[PDB]
Amino acid sequence: NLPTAQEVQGLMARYIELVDVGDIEAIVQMFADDATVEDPFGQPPIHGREQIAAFYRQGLGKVRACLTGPVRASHNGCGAMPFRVEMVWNGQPCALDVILVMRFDEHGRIQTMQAYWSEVNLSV
Amino acid sequence: NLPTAQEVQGLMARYIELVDVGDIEAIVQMFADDATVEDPFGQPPIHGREQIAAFYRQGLGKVRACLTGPVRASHNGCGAMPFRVEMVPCALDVILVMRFDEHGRIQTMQAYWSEVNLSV
């Protein structure tokens, strides 16, 4: 709980913005110190800011990202949003369609994050 | 969680199709006996076929629905999709997250949305 539906809308919209510019440390800061990330969902959860920062640094360490639909928020501090990421793999432009689901804590920080996507969502 | 990524895409797309035509019996058949529905997510879990059937009865019992983006599937039998529901004259943007069992039936259904996502 804590963040209202509107606040969730704002936090998740900002996440996309941070990912887009690639500000790794600002992204990490949005996460609870002990948050867990599953990206893609189905893979082992990654625990803690050190591990999360290493994760984003690997992926974002050249990439554009934008919402492709509005954020769907709840009244219990959770939300979901659809988005697309554009990256350059092997010097070639690729697109990845994803849907992120997040649960925030009483301090407005991301406690849980789950990114839904597979190969079928990747394209050029 | 046996259903593959492509099979999840198909099942989730069929669900939307069924909702769009309003075939409650067909929709309910898609769920497993132990299934739980959280719609909107944040509201108490609904379980029991008679209960899930009654939930759809009240909602679809003129309603239309369409995918507004591709289904995002995983390899552990789960998927998420963005869609729009038109009903009463208004529109609602939703995102459904679902987990299927080893039989390809809905085990978990979670629909995210709130008043903000509503448009009249």
Swiss-Prot record, chain A:
Q: Which GO terms describe its molecular function?
A: steroid Delta-isomerase activity
Reactions it catalyzes? a 3-oxo-Delta(5)-steroid = a 3-oxo-Delta(4)-steroid
What residues sit in the active site? Y15 (proton donor), D39 (proton acceptor)
Q: What induces it?
A: By steroids.
Q: List UniProt keywords, sorted A-Z.
A: Isomerase, Lipid metabolism, Steroid metabolism
Q: Where does substrate bind?
A: L100
Enzyme Commission no: 5.3.3.1
BP GO terms, sorted: steroid metabolic process
Q: List the disulfide bonds.
A: none
- Impact after mutating Y15S: Reduces activity 20-fold
Kindly give the Gene3D superfamilies that the UniProt entry links to this protein: 3.10.450.50
Q: Which domain of life is it from?
A: Bacteria
**Major enzyme class:** isomerase
Q: Which SUPFAM superfamilies match?
A: NTF2-like
Instruction: Tell me the leader sequence span.
Output: none
Protein name (database record):
Steroid Delta-isomerase
From Swiss-Prot, chain B:
Would the keyword Isomerase be found if you checked this record's keyword annotation? yes
CDD domains the UniProt entry points to: ketosteroid_isomerase
Q: Which UniProt keywords apply?
A: Isomerase, Lipid metabolism, Steroid metabolism
- Give the result of V120A, as annotated: Slightly reduces activity and reduces protein stability
Keyword Lipid metabolism included in the entry's annotation: yes
Q: What is its EC number?
A: 5.3.3.1
Substrates-to-products reaction catalysed: a 3-oxo-Delta(5)-steroid = a 3-oxo-Delta(4)-steroid
Which residue positions are annotated as catalytic? Y15 (proton donor), D39 (proton acceptor)
Q: According to the record, what induces this protein's expression? A: By steroids.
Q: Known InterPro entries for this protein?
A: Ketosteroid_isomerase, NTF2-like_dom_sf, SnoaL-like
| Single GO biological process annotation from the record | steroid metabolic process
Instruction: Tell me what happens on changing Y56S.
Output: Reduces activity 100-fold
Q: Which Pfam families match?
A: SnoaL_2
Q: How does it associate, per the subunit comment?
A: Homodimer.
Tell me what this protein is called: Steroid Delta-isomerase
Q: What gene name is listed for this protein?
A: ksi
